[PDB]
Amino acid sequence: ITGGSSAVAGQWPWQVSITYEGVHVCGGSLVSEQWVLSAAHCFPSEHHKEAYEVKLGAHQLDSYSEDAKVSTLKDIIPHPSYLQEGSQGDIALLQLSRPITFSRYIRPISLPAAQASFPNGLHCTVTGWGHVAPSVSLLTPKPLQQLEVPLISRETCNSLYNIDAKPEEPHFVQEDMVCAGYVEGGKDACQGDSGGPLSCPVEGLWYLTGIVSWGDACGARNRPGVYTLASSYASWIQSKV
Amino acid sequence: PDFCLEPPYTGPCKARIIRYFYNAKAGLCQTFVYGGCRAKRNNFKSAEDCMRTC
The missing domain is CATH 2.40.10.10 (Trypsin-like serine proteases)
Structure with missing residues (x-):
């Protein structure tokens, strides 16, 4: 993370x-x-x-x-x-x-029903033992790491990904996905965090909103991480x- | 050889899967972290699968 x-x-x-x-x-x-x-x-x-x-x-x-x-x-x-x-x-x-x-x-954690929508900019937490930077390991004894990241609509997230997009490296956010992170980067999930929960609090209660999936780098500008939607x-x- | 000249490609996915790539400058079969998708060709499941190919 x-x-x-x-x-x-x-x-x-x-x-x-x-x-x-x-x-x-x-x-x-x-x-x-x-x-x-x-x-x-x-x-x-x-x-x-x-x-x-x-x-x-x-x-x-x-x-x-x-x-x-x-x-x-x-x-x-x-x-x-x-x-x-x-x-x-x-x-x-x-x-x-x-x-x-x-x-x-x-x-x-509780799963969200199929017809469940979380507002954009809602702050959620992703958690993992992934790299703390591009190919830089989390340091032993590897404490679970956490991070608050705001949810980003898939339309806006596709806008971001198009910035400096390499024609040969297409990234598209599909309907089964959602983005969370910061546009200036530095905060994101990295290698080893896949499968991790994106836990979103809704009224003192944690829902599994997404499963850590992919992203351009990690801490990359205009490349917030993409998560698989649980709903x-x-x-x-x-x-x- | 060929694609043996490309750098190791981690790819977009965020798993930590260990793979081998040929470091042509080094003359060596090196370990890198693969993410789980969009693997290029300079990416081997094993050290000898690597030296063999290049």
């Missing part, structure tokens, strides 16, 4: 770490006793389900946390729309091998609850 700050331990109980062969590759967000939302690209077909693990209640990634359950994965369902796009449908459900027990440090998939996700 570029330009953020360290969360207190237990401040984002729905945040999870995703490891392939014991290496953190993606963040994730817990949504029930046994399910996790993340991003489709964090799970290329070449990888083996058996080698995916998940860490929860994990505040400092490189530290033995007392209450920090770890689980293998029973299932991985990327959205049907994905394997034929690389343009849309960038989300996956992870079924844990066994349902886990909630504690002060492990707790799911655009509520229908689908509800099809396994």
Whole structure:
């Protein structure tokens, strides 16, 4: 997370770490006793389900946390729309091998209904253990990082992306997406934050508005990060609850 | 060889997937962080997949 700050331990109980062969590759967000939302690209077909693990209640990634359950994965369902796009449908459900027990440090976030809209400029928080700058690692013991970022309409976000757009590197924000960040940059999610929650408070209550997805760089001017809309998939996700 | 001359391309997505690229100036197969999409061709799953190609 570029330009953020360290969360207190237990401040984002729905945040999870995703490891392939014991290496953190993606963040994730817990949504029930046994399910996790993340991003489709964090799970290329070449990888083996058996080698995916998940860490929860994990505040400092490189530290033995007392209450920090770890689980293998029973299932991985990327959205049907994905394997034929690389343009849309960038989300996956992870079924844990066994349902886990909630504690002060492990707790799911609520999903927004399909017909849910969040006002622009609403300040939301993204959270991850990603690079703190273009290819610069978060420093051990890797405290979960957080960052308030305002939501940006997809029309305005496409205006931004067109600024100094490289014809060969097209970035378009699709209907299943939303942007959050600052136009002058410096604040944004980076590599390793994919799958992470964009949590938006609505009346003392946290909703999973987006899943960290992609962005031009991270801290780039006129290139705020793009997140996969949770609401655009509520229908689908509800099809396994 | 060929595209073995391009710099490593991380791409727009924000996963942390470790990949190898050929550093032609260095004469070396180097690790970089790939994001999970829009990979160029100078991007290998393994060190030897790399040296082999270039």
